């Protein structure tokens, strides 16, 4: 289900209209503790407990920071830490020295991924001990930001039904003519299997006619 | 199971039983009515004894004799008159052992020359 | 252009397909032919005893002399006239 | 465990010293931070110097990250947080003193910083092209005929992708458009109207290949057609004038046969 997801018009209408606060030195309005959780059990993600957010672990919120990138960009982290350290077929490099930079390296991805997505949604300042070593105050912070966004990405979903609905019409005219390729196939390869078995109904009535007749001959 | 590629493999079978059938269908013949047209020789009754073989010579069927198979074989009726030494002859013919053949080569050439 | 009901036309081909009949057709002709040796076996068995022998596979005919054990063959054409088919195998014997 | 790496051999030292060098020389180290660096100062430190270069080679590699004025104290939770594979072999009294006998285990992290800069910078590049790529093959990957039924749905999902990124770089315009106070995400969804035609024309040209492997296939089953409808006549002529032959043949011997014994049986 991708592409598919963001097609609504009147399916959810869960998340409330976007707001924006002139007034506190974030554009965002900042979120309590109670208006952040409400979403994120309507919204698609996964929560334990209202508390734990309030005494964010470490271990926890790497893990809701990776649904967050998956969700909101659309990018695999597991895919592109594959990609980020392929095998590369230059003779410079070593498998002993790649060891030591195969951990490091890929905590450095997923912290410019989350640093660039934080900084689109107005949030500069994204550490890596934003992950690993988790503050109660900064997350409201950061958490109040991707809920605003979430507001806004429902608001401008009524203007893109145009764009999934006519990609709809074209894969399905596609897979229509992919279906009637095979159907053309199928239906031919049945043609030849009904006059095989009749014409091997008439070599044995043939052969039969032969063998008896022989008999009361020769 | 059978496919029409291998047709041709009934198409052979078909040709060996059309020659075998058109074969054994032209064997027979008819071995009396050629041993009446090459000998020019037909086995008749007798008209006085249904077991008394006619042999008749010639297609005019003008000169015939006959003769009984029971017992000694001895000469009946014939359309040309014979001579009792003629006659005599031919049982002397039949008198020996000798053939069939022999009395009917002396038969067919009296019966023939008394015309 | 094409077949309307090619499936259909190979089963009429093969229900029209009679068996029997040739069957019981090479019956009687060889009943046929127990006829002919039976009521023609009085006749040649007369006529083997002659001295003349008919060999139909080769075209031939098979005149023996006892004495001599030398066997005379009389093979048959489309130019042979009837005449002299009968005098060469009479008189011969 | 301990650094597998001569880290005391002089020859060793002066490689790395070299490599630092010239990163930071080419890096425009001394411009940014306003102090110059020279060989001769990796070689004999000072702690003022060493934290100079330290945030400076971090601040590359997590740049939104905001250092306090105490750094010695940051320093063992940042080569944590890093994965540093030789912390075991760094203690936590050496870093307020670096230029001790011990530099040679902060020398070897120094140049674990210049390596990390430059793996992460070619490591982010790659990572770019697999953001790209979905977009970049387009008719080429698609257009050739699909050998079983997963690679057509697997051409599917690549076209889902590439519409589900047009969305995602739409909200995400039209956000920022929205965050500075505009509230006319007009060129926002230019955009996506431009991205989305791209999108038409390499279906478009999907349809139209698929049109003409449809066609082809029409007309090859029909020549297929054509021949086994010629066979199955052939085997309905050949058959029927082999009964025929056989059942002319008994009538003819049956009428020979029925007058050789009339003639047997007439001559009498
Ligand atoms: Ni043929």
Redesign the interface.
């Known amino acids: 289900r991708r592409s598919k997801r963001f097609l609504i018009s009147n399916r959810t209408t869960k998340l409330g209209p976007a707001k924006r606060a002139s007034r506190n030195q974030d554009v965002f309005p900042i979120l309590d503790l109670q208006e952040l959780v409400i979403c994120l059990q309507s919204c698609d993600f996964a929560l334990a407990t209202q508390e734990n957010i309030s005494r964010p672990t470490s271990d926890y919120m790497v893990t809701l920071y990776k649904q967050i990138i998956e969700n909101f960009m659309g990018i695999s982290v597991e895919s592109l830490l594959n990609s980020s350290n392929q095998e590369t077929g230059d003779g410079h490099l070593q498998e002993e020295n790649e060891n030591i930079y195969l951990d490091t390296l890929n905590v450095l991805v997923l912290n410019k991924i989350c640093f660039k997505f934080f900084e689109n949604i107005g949030v500069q300042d994204f550490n890596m001990t934003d992950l690993y070593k988790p503050e109660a105050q900064r997350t409201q912070r950061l958490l109040s930001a991707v809920v605003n966004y979430a507001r806004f990405r429902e608001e401008r979903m009524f203007d893109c039904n145009s764009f999934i609905l006519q990609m709809e019409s074209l894969l399905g005219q596609i897979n229509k003519l992919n279906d009637e390729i095979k159907q053309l196939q199928k239906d031919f390869e049945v043609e030849v299997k009904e006059i095989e078995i009749e014409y091997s109904l008439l070599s044995g009535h043939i052969n039969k006619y032969m063998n008896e007749m022989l008999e009361y001959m020769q | 199971?059978?496919?029409?590629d291998?047709?041709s493999d009934?198409?052979r079978?078909?040709d060996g039983?059309?020659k075998?059938?058109?074969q054994?269908?032209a064997?027979?013949?008819?071995?009396?009515?050629?041993?009446?047209?090459?000998?020019?020789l037909?086995?008749?009754?007798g008209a006085s004894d249904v077991h008394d073989?006619r042999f008749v010579f010639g297609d005019d069927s003008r000169c015939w004799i006959e003769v009984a198979m029971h017992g000694d074989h001895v000469i009946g009726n014939s359309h040309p008159a014979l001579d009792p030494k003629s006659r005599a002859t031919l049982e002397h013919v039949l008198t020996v052992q000798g053939?069939?053949?022999a009395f009917?080569?002396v038969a067919?050439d009296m019966l023939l020359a008394s015309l | 252009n094409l077949l309307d009901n090619p499936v259909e036309f190979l089963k009429e081909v093969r229900e029209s397909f009679d068996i029997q009949q040739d069957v019981d057709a090479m019956k009687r002709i060889r009943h046929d032919l127990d006829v002919i040796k039976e009521e023609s076996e009085a006749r040649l068995k007369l006529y083997r005893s002659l001295g003349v022998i008919l060999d139909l596979e080769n075209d031939q005919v098979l005149i023996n002399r006892k004495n001599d054990g030398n066997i005379d063959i009389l093979p048959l054409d489309n130019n042979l006239s009837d005449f002299y088919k009968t005098k060469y195998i009479w008189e011969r014997l | 465990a301990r650094d597998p790496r001569p880290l005391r051999d002089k020859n060793f030292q002066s490689a790395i010293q070299e490599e630092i060098y010239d990163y930071l020389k080419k890096n425009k180290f001394d411009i940014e931070t306003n102090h110059p660096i020279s060989i001769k100062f990796l070689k004999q430190p000072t702690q003022k110097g060493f934290i100079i270069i330290f945030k400076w080679l971090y601040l590359r590699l997590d740049p939104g990250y905001g250092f306090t004025k105490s750094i010695e104290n940051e320093i063992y939770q940042i080569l944590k947080n890093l994965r540093y594979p030789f912390l075991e072999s760094i203690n936590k009294s050496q870093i307020s003193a670096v230029g001790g006998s011990n530099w040679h285990k902060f020398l070897g992290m120094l140049h674990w910083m210049v390596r990390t800069n430059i793996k992460l910078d070619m490591c982010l590049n790659k990572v770019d092209r697999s953001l790209i790529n979905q977009n970049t093959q387009e008719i080429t990957i698609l257009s050739q005929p699909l050998k079983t039924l997963d690679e057509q749905d697997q051409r599917q999902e690549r076209y889902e992708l590439m519409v589900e990124k047009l969305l995602i770089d739409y909200f995400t315009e039209s956000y920022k458009s929205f965050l500075k106070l505009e509230d006319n995400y007009e060129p926002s969804m230019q955009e996506l109207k431009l991205g989305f035609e791209k999108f038409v024309h390499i279906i478009n040209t999907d349809v139209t290949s698929t049109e003409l492997k449809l066609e082809e296939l029409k007309v090859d089953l029909n020549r297929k057609r054509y021949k086994l409808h010629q066979q199955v006549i052939h085997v309905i002529d050949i058959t029927s004038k082999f009964k025929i032959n056989i059942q002319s043949s008994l009538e003819n011997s049956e009428n020979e046969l029925g007058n050789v014994i009339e003639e047997l049986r007439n001559l009498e």
């Open positions: 199971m059978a496919s029409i291998a047709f009934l198409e079978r078909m039983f059309q075998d059938v058109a054994v269908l064997r027979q013949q008819n071995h009396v009515a050629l041993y009446e047209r090459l000998l020019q037909r086995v008749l009754p073989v053939d069939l053949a009917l080569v067919r």
